[PDB]
């Protein structure tokens, strides 16, 4: 069970920890979050009072060093920086521990929510679609553009997301144009699962990691990389058993924790109808389609 | 963006064009079989491809064998359409190649944009317009070589046969519309307006009579009068 210490609360804020979420007043007495799973990958987060635009926040995984939060009155926001000292650190977390200055990881025994998450979310793949190398925790928020958003402007602030665009050469072989474009397999499982992403678990984990940037920092270009991860498997024919089997699980576990009052932004219609009721796929993604209907059947 | 009334003479101007219109392509008559069943059986079809500058046509015929064995044919003919025309960009010299192509079908884009990834300086564009390129094949002397043909061939044609030495491409362009919309909204009558008097005839290297500007007129005239008594006819109005 590990500890991110908070330096202090100078400005009135909405944290967050994953799923979970507080407020804290200006200059409350709060030092921090414990109780972390080891284990996962993990999101803090924060909304300020004053300013409910710019959600940021930061990917971390307290297996990889020890970091805490300090507030910068300068740069006017929560920092996240590692602590070198083990003694130092550990000597912080003890005295703010005893003085029970601390917010526990609010976890219930029974709920698998944050693992059926970040299932296969690694920090080592974050942190490449994240470039920030000298960091072991990564910085996003709700303004940060994409790679393939960029294209269509400063290189060192963008999310590197795999880019997926079904009008383009790496999709459709000379000669095959009709057949790649109706049944994008070929894509799928040479170009992306077998070139790029090497596995399944890889594509994944950027698939649910898109997902997460969107839902807890309103991240557009996030939104759109998982809806083309999602499009792409649901549009190719030949998809190996285990992958719908789990994108199944996934998708059902993203629509379960999705705020009621977000599908409006966060769910793309036109992707989701042919998802569920027109792609090769309509018939493999039974416990995603009946949470979807159940929850928001005006979107379909 | 779509091509309409507002950027109209944009066709007429030095900047290479074509029109693709894919009506034509795929082409049926629908039967009752002996069980008492319906079936289609294809006749040959076209691609209708036009430089609506230059009155140049490309008339690709598409030759029923194309269709041998083939599922979900009306899908599969806006594909061909796209590797015919872009197929015809590739065999025409740089200078030759368009700039923007304009479909008549929206269903159209995404086939054309796919086949035409290698070419992205060449916009494919749909149009506003309600073009009437479908009756090309009212057109007796295009109706023939594609009746006729027994294999996969590419024909071409001026469309606007001597006109340009005489009119602008707008006018050219205006008057093929009218001709074509006329032979749509009532082919028979369109056909005994062109053809009358026995002393006009067709030049063996022509597709229209060969009218003077007079003539023209007269005839132009016979074809707006033949589209508004159809039109009060449709609505009852």
Redesign the interface.
């Known amino acids: 069970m590990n500890t991110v210490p908070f330096t202090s609360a100078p400005i009135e804020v909405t944290i967050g920890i994953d799923q979970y979420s507080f407020n804290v007043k200006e200059n409350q007495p709060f030092h921090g979050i414990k109780d972390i799973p080891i284990g996962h990958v993990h999101v803090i987060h924060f909304q300020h009072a004053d300013n409910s635009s710019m959600r940021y926040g930061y990917w971390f995984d307290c297996r990889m060093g020890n970091f805490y939060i300090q507030y910068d009155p300068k740069d006017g926001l929560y920092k996240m920086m590692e602590e070198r000292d083990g003694a130092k650190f550990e000597n912080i977390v003890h005295n703010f521990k005893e003085r029970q200055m601390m917010v526990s990881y609010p976890k219930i025994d029974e709920d698998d929510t944050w693992y059926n998450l970040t299932e296969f979310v690694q920090m080592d793949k974050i942190r490449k679609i994240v470039r920030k190398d000298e960091n072991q925790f990564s910085y996003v928020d709700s303004s940060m553009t994409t790679v393939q958003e960029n294209e269509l402007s400063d290189p060192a602030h963008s999310l590197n997301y795999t880019v997926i665009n079904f ?3 790496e999709a ?1 072989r ?1 000669g095959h ?2 057949e790649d ?1 109706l049944d994008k397999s070929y894509y799928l499982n040479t170009v992306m699962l077998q070139g790029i992403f090497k596995n399944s678990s890889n594509y994944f984990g950027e698939l649910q990691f898109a997902f997460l940037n969107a839902m807890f920092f309103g991240n557009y270009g996030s939104s759109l990389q998982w809806h083309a991860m999602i499009e792409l498997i649901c549009s190719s024919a030949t998809v190996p058993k285990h992958m719908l089997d789990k994108l199944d699980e996934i998708l059902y576990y993203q629509i379960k924790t999705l705020p009621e009052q977000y599908s409006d932004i966060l769910l793309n219609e036109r992707v989701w109808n042919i998802c569920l009721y027109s792609s090769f796929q309509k018939n493999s993604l039974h416990n995603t389609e009946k949470i979807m209907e159940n929850k928001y059947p005006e979107l379909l | 963006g779509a091509m309409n009334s507002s950027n109209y003479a944009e066709l007429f101007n030095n900047d290479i064009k074509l029109f693709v219109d894919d009506t034509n392509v795929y082409r049926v008559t629908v039967h009752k079989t002996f069980e008492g069943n319906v079936a289609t059986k294809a006749i040959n079809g076209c691609i209708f491809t036009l430089n609506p500058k230059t009155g140049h046509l490309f008339l690709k015929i598409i030759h029923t064998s194309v269709w041998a064995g083939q599922k979900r044919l009306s899908q ?1 003919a806006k ?1 061909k359409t ?2 015919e025309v872009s197929a015809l960009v590739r065999s025409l010299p740089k200078e030759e190649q368009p700039k923007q192509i304009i479909v008549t079908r929206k269903a159209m884009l ?2 054309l ?3 035409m ?2 070419f992205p300086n060449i916009a494919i564009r749909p149009t506003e317009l309600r073009l009437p390129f479908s009756a090309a094949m009212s057109i007796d002397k295009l109706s023939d070589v594609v009746m006729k043909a027994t294999e996969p061939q590419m024909v071409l044609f001026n469309i606007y046969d001597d006109w340009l030495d005489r009119i602008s491409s707008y006018t050219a362009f205006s008057r093929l519309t009218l001709l074509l919309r006329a032979l749509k909204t009532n082919e028979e009558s369109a056909k005994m307006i062109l053809l009358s008097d026995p002393t006009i005839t067709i030049k063996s290297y022509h597709l229209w009579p060969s009218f003077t500007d007079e003539q023209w007129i007269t005839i132009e005239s016979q074809m707006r009068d033949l589209i508004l008594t159809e039109y009060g006819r449709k609505y009852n109005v």
Do not use: N, Q, T, Y
Request: glycine fraction near 0%.
């Open positions: 009008k383009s050469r459709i000379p144009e009709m474009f | 599969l594909w796209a590797e995404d086939p944009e796919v086949h990834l290698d």
